Amino acid sequence: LAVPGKVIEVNGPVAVVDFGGVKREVRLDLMPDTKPGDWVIVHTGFAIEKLDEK
Amino acid sequence: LAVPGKVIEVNGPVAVVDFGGVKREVRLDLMPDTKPGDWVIVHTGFAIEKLDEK
Amino acid sequence: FEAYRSREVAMKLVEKIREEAKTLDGEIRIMHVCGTHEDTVTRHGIRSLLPENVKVVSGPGCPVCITPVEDIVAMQLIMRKAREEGEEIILTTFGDMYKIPTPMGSFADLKSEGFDVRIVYGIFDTYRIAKENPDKTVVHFSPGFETTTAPAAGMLNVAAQEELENFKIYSVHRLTPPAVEVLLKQGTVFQGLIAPGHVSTIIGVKGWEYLTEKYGIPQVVAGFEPNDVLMAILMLIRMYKEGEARIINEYERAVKYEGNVVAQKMIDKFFEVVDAKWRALGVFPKSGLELRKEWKDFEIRSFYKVEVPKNLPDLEKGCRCGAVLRGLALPTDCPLFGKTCTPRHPVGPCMVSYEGTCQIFYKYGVL
Amino acid sequence: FEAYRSREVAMKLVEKIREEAKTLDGEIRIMHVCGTHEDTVTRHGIRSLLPENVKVVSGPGCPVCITPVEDIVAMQLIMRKAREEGEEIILTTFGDMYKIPTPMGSFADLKSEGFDVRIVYGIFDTYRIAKENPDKTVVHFSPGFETTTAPAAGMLNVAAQEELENFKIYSVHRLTPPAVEVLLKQGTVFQGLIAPGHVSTIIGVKGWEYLTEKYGIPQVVAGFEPNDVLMAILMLIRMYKEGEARIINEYERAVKYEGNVVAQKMIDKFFEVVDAKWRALGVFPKSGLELRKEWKDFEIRSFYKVEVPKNLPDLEKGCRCGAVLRGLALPTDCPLFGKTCTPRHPVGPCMVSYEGTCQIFYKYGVL
Amino acid sequence: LRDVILKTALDDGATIPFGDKHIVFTIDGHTVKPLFFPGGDIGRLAVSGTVNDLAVMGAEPIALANSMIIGEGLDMEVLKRVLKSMDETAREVPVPIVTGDTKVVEDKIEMFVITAGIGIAEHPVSDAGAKVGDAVLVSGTIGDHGIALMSHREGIAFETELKSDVAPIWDVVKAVAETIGWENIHAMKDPTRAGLSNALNEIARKSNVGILVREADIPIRPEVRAASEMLGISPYDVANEGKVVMVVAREYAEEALEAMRKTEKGRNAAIIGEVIADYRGKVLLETGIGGKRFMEPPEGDPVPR
Amino acid sequence: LRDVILKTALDDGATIPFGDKHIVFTIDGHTVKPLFFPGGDIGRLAVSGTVNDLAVMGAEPIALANSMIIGEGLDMEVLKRVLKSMDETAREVPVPIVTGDTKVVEDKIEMFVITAGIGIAEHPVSDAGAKVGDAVLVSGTIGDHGIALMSHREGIAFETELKSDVAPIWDVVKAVAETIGWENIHAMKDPTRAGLSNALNEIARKSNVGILVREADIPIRPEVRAASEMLGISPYDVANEGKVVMVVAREYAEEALEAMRKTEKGRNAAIIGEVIADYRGKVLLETGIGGKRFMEPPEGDPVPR
Numbered sequence A, B: 001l002a003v004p005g006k007v008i009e010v011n012g013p014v015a016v017v018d019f020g021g022v023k024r025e026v027r028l029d030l031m032p033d034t035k036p037g038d039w040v041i042v043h044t045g046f047a048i049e050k051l052d053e054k
Numbered sequence C, D: 001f002e003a004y005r006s007r008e009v010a011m012k013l014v015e016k017i018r019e020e021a022k023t024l025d026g027e028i029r030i031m032h033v034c035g036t037h038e039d040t041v042t043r044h045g046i047r048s049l050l051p052e053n054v055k056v057v058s059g060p061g062c063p064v065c066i067t068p069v070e071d072i073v074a075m076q077l078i079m080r081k082a083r084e085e086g087e088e089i090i091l092t093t094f095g096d097m098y099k100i101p102t103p104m105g106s107f108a109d110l111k112s113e114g115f116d117v118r119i120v121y122g123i124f125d126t127y128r129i130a131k132e133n134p135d136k137t138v139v140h141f142s143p144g145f146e147t148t149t150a151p152a153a154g155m156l157n158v159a160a161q162e163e164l165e166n167f168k169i170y171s172v173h174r175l176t177p178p179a180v181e182v183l184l185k186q187g188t189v190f191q192g193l194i195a196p197g198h199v200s201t202i203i204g205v206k207g208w209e210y211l212t213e214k215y216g217i218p219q220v221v222a223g224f225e226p227n228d229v230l231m232a233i234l235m236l237i238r239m240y241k242e243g244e245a246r247i248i249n250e251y252e253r254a255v256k257y258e259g260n261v262v263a264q265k266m267i268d269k270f271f272e273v274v275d276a277k278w279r280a281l282g283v284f285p286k287s288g289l290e291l292r293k294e295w296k297d298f299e300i301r302s303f304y305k306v307e308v309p310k311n312l313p314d315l316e317k318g319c320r321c322g323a324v325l326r327g328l329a330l331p332t333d334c335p336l337f338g339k340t341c342t343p344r345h346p347v348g349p350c351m352v353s354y355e356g357t358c359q360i361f362y363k364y365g366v367l
Numbered sequence E, F: 001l002r003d004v005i006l007k008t009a010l011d012d013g014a015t016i017p018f019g020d021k022h023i024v025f026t027i028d029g030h031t032v033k034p035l036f037f038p039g040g041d042i043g044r045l046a047v048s049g050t051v052n053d054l055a056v057m058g059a060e061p062i063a064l065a066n067s068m069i070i071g072e073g074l075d076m077e078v079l080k081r082v083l084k085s086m087d088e089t090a091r092e093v094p095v096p097i098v099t100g101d102t103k104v105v106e107d108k109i110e111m112f113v114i115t116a117g118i119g120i121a122e123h124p125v126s127d128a129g130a131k132v133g134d135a136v137l138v139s140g141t142i143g144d145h146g147i148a149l150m151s152h153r154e155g156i157a158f159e160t161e162l163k164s165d166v167a168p169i170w171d172v173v174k175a176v177a178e179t180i181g182w183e184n185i186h187a188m189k190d191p192t193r194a195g196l197s198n199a200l201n202e203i204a205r206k207s208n209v210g211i212l213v214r215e216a217d218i219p220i221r222p223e224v225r226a227a228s229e230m231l232g233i234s235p236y237d238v239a240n241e242g243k244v245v246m247v248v249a250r251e252y253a254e255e256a257l258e259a260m261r262k263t264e265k266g267r268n269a270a271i272i273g274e275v276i277a278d279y280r281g282k283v284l285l286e287t288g289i290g291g292k293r294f295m296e297p298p299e300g301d302p303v304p305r
């Protein structure tokens, strides 16, 4: 039920992400290596993976 | 849910009755004094009362 | 015969009713508490003949509907328990009760599990079955008001005499008069009561007199022909206007002022009055009939102690059958009536029981 | 973005599919096991684009639907028990599970009884609640496949680290791959599997390879855009015709061949694989995830021993949700679909869960 | 019971115009258990049903075709007996059973009888031609067959035996037609499954009209009345296998009624009501006492109340 | 929610012909909580709603009457604020709020606003006048108000604030009318409760016609798209308080569209589909990828999926 979002801010294991314009927080307990440059997949407020240059 | 019937035969506490033409047996544990002349009220195969010349 | 169904009679009564109701101060709500009566009113569409200010509401006149789930579930538990004890029990129950729903499934589902569930038509059919199988214990889930408590308490006598051993019954019998009282006391309103005909055949007018003297509500022991109800509705409209509070045995042709004393005594022999639970209605004091301490042997519950799960809802979400049994609404005042709830796929018991107010409204497609 | 939703792309794929399916020997039944996938197929009406001989069926891709009533009822028993012990527990559960029906009533009904039932959106919301009320024990009825088992097993780590004490969960997590196997073994037919995208994000392609090698069924880890499914349906139609049995990571943009090893490990830390019960489907071996003997403290069931009533039916009479979860029928092949069963007044879970095959067919009014 | 077979015309009387007439083609199966019942048997039931299916569509029975599926180990006398009824009944129309086929299956099933039939109608009739003002007629008593068979099951016996009405009624329809003209018979329906109530609702629904019926005018045997009350089912919802409902132009209501009564199979025929503009798609019943309520078609097969 | 009040006309726009015109009379209550939301408030909502109720029936807003039921202990500034919006909005039509009434109840309820309105239409229009071939137009983005309010509830904030579209659109309708002639506007409906999907189904059902809509042509904001997916609800089923659906004669589809776009409230207007003879009473949606499925009206108020 996940939608893709652009990470705009990171604060330890508590990144923040944007989805087509929505600001929502996202835990990073599954993706410790997330830089604001990365785009993540959010599932119930969590990060499961990071996208690729597909 | 009872319908009225004319008693056509009696055999101890096991009278027999007719309802507009149907022959069905009827216990008489509630009406020991039923003569084939009487008309009774049948409720689940039993006799609850006898009619009157109303 | 005819005179009791004659259109002439009916149209004279309807006219008389129409006239009286004309000088009536407000809205008169007459109530009946017998399923057969509701069927009479709906089948002949009497309501489509009564003045706008004259209303007839249904009461808890269905022995099956008000049968607690707790007991139905409990009976199924005994079935499984008895089996776990090499005892394959024969279960006999009425056609509609056989289908009544419970969160744990119906008796029909127990049948689809190997258990021997047989639909009887009278307590006797069960009796016939008992002797035909003295090896297995044959039990009858027995519900019913005074009218059906008699046959049962009458067959227990033929069980005590013959000293029969495999003849048991699950007693969930109920008392009509009491429920009528609990209702008055609980808010249900009405200016007159059409006493159930055959319930009055057994307990006689005597059995009802106490409600009139205590609450001043006029009564009429009516029969079941269309004219019987129309005649009764007439009297009640009058007694109300003239200020009386007395009972009138319209069904005198089939009712003795003191009812049948034989049955009375016989019942009082095997059953004792106890506080009972009425499904979707609550606990009504002195409205149940469980076998006396003595004949504790005819009660299948004596042999098996069972634990019925707690928190078993009486009705499914949406079912307003509780309000329908209290005369606080007709089945057409229910959001599920005719939609999600129908005899084919019912939600509450009011639509399953042969005498359910809802099954009767659907069946005759009320106007 | 666009390229993954582009009508051009889709119409090229649809054409390609149409061509291939032309030289196909018979009827190909591709199956997917993720709710999100069913929603994708139905929302964009992909089925209305596929050839007559190409079929897409749904599998047990709903974590809520397959959650056993026994556990839901058990959780409500703990609620009442805990209260009977001066312990007012805080219950957190997903929006749809909150409404799931059981013969004993739903979690929503427990809410209408004074109990504190709060609809969360993520295991974290529950976590947020725990600290905000360290006086009361906050428990989360936690259902879900690999995709949701991760966040949970990830928050338990933040629970072990912080050594938090009032953070419990009712574990009813399930394993996708196994169910797919039990299905092949039990008769369900299909020539290709569209592996759930995000379930594959966690357990990676590796987690699926074993089904192909064991049963020779080609697979495709597909995404969720309309083109993703269309692209996957294409590959499967080919691999079938050409005779292959290999997995293809179409969703490679978001899937690592080995999936996320962090989550994997983390899950394997707090949970151990056990035989589980799938509602309306039966007992699937090694398909459940209950907390390991060690962290027996995070399982609310550790503190309270309860007795769930026996003989609790999985579905109500008429509900063919069992056949719908097995890919043996679509919700339109059900006599109650759109009639007595709708999201407003549902019969089976398949119509309640946000990812229920039935709720999705009604919601988008399948053609 | 799902109408998949419809979208997968189909499943109803079919007309095929040819020359200046229309060929009416029908077919119906029978799994009646027991094969034998008071007043008739599966064989007569099969022929009567199909002949009637053609009569209500305004087609004269031209021929019948019969396919029998016999289960291995079927009392041969039973089968012979059934075949006699078929030939006996077919001659009552008259109508020849021009062709046939027989199959033996190992499955224990006694027997199934599938009958097809063709008719010629110069003036087709359907349950969608009822017009407001038209008279509604029923050719005989209601509840015979249904109650007959149910009573046999429940032991209920009767003074003078109560038996099924199973029988072809082409003669009854032809009578009316030849007496008032096909153009004047607006609609027909055989009150079989679901009974009279179902039949009326159908005409009402397919003609988008309300139908008013007077309970006091509906022909019902004294045996049926008693049996119906006992079993707790109304004779309106039980099957009829030898009756026809006929909607006729008001100006021919009386003429038609007499024509029916002049026949043996329409001896008890009568006028039970009329089509109205109100309550379209519904059937309104005026009870004996002057009351009113709808005559709803049962949801499923009836059981004692 | 039972339609007892109907049988006890009633409950829908009423027309009363007088002179050569028709008086259109309507009334609607509001229990919107909170009284305030992104882009508007109960006051504007009340006036906008009623003005629009008259516009879709082809009547020019002649006057408004407002009855307020205020709960004891209501922030006075709130009430003043609400009254300002009402007067501010009414002038945007323009249309005078000729009369009023006020009541104070002890019950704690903040406030309820009941608005009535009258209009004059020389050429009445209803959701039952859609004809096959006609073009279907929506005057603006879909899902604004509904999503706006839901997002406020769920904390969801947006880069540039996403707000309700609440506003009267008589100007938009008048524009079209004065550009193509009332005779050429076959049907209208305000996509408020239940959203666009409900509105279309209604027109389709009350005009007994099928309506084909192209998902690719339905105007939806990027904010609405994102928010809709997150909450798990489609923007088609959420309320709109400043939009109008318009079914126009095919030959004027292009002319109307331009007329709408020439206004501020119809700036994003567009042509989303057409009326067809098939699927009468239903709404068929052609998805972006060329697929097809029905656009069913939600059963009850939406919740996140």
Ligand code: SF4
Pocket (backbone or CB within 6 Å): C318, C319, C320, C321, C322, C324, C331, C334, C335, C336, C337, C338, C341, C342, C346, C347, C348, C349, C350, C351, C358
């Ligand atoms: S109709 Fe059904 S659901 Fe409504 S009260 Fe009567 S039985 Fe309950």
Ligand code: SF4
Pocket (backbone or CB within 6 Å): D318, D319, D320, D321, D322, D324, D331, D334, D335, D336, D337, D338, D341, D342, D346, D347, D348, D349, D350, D351, D358
């Ligand atoms: S529609 Fe309902 S009832 Fe049919 S299977 Fe799907 S949920 Fe079960």
